[PDB]
Symmetry: C3
Amino acid sequence: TKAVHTKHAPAAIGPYSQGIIVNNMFYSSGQIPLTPSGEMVNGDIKEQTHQVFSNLKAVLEEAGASFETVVKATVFIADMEQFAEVNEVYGQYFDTHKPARSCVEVARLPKDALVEIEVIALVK
Amino acid sequence: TKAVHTKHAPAAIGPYSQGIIVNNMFYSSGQIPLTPSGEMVNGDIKEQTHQVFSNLKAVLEEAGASFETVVKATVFIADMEQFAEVNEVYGQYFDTHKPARSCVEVARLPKDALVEIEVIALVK
Amino acid sequence: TKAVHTKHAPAAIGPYSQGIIVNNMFYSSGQIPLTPSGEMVNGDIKEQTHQVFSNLKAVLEEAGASFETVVKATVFIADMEQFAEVNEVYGQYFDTHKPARSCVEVARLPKDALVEIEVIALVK
Ligand code: EMC
Ligand code: EMC
Ligand SMILES: [Hg+2]
């Protein structure tokens, strides 16, 4: 296995890696709405979801994967009432290639993020 | 890789698939107590859990897998006080074959479901 | 494919196994702060986190894996305010090897545990 590191996603500060490649698969850590420089995006839920996807895009590509090779995503949201809004952004990235997915509302997320998304993808 | 599609489980409406096959593994989306026609199952926690299992059975079989090949499941429930009830139904399907599992109470689930379950299984 | 069992981790009572090996990958069930004898270690978040890791170490080793081959972990904590404390202990185990990770505060964990962790690891 190998750790994935890219300056285009917030730095993994602490005991974890942005993602890991093992065999021919890639596992990302759960991405939250932080900018690469480590600041929380303070726009609405859509703006927060966009940063999450920019972060996912960066780690996926550094690992030799892409949204087109994602097989499973788990979405943790702070409020299920915002499902539709997060889904609108989500659908711009997984429009034709559609991964398996699970979505649940949690009590709280790191840095009180409104959304956190993790993915597993094939490395071709 | 292949998206799994079955008319014997609620349709995946939107940017996700009922399940995905990659390498020799199958990943399902989290299944909720909806009938194939899209209606939330009428009834208590056991009836809801049974519908979730009917949905998993449908996607597993379409993927060339079965409850006997499930390796890991994640169970999200609306109320931990109903754990025994969910477990009793869960046990009917994993009678002698026992997957790895994590079970937790979340704040809320899609469509206010009382239970949601996702599985990962080997494709024989 | 096969179930993993070790007397050095709490017995799996119910329809699940402590872990499952499929291909060259090990999937653990979520581990909570129970001692091998089945009772909650009493003590603060630090002691609870250490017990969860003792349990993970036992199932990992029985499966032929180790903390050094863990590729992804999912951490569930009862109180996000305890993130720093749990992270301090977590870092002692994933020191030179840093897996991908996701962390969320759910509504409730089995036995009102303060922390629960599941892992996926490579079997060398
Ligand atoms: C991607 C909507 Hg839970
Ligand atoms: C290991 C801190 Hg969520
Ligand atoms: Hg549970």
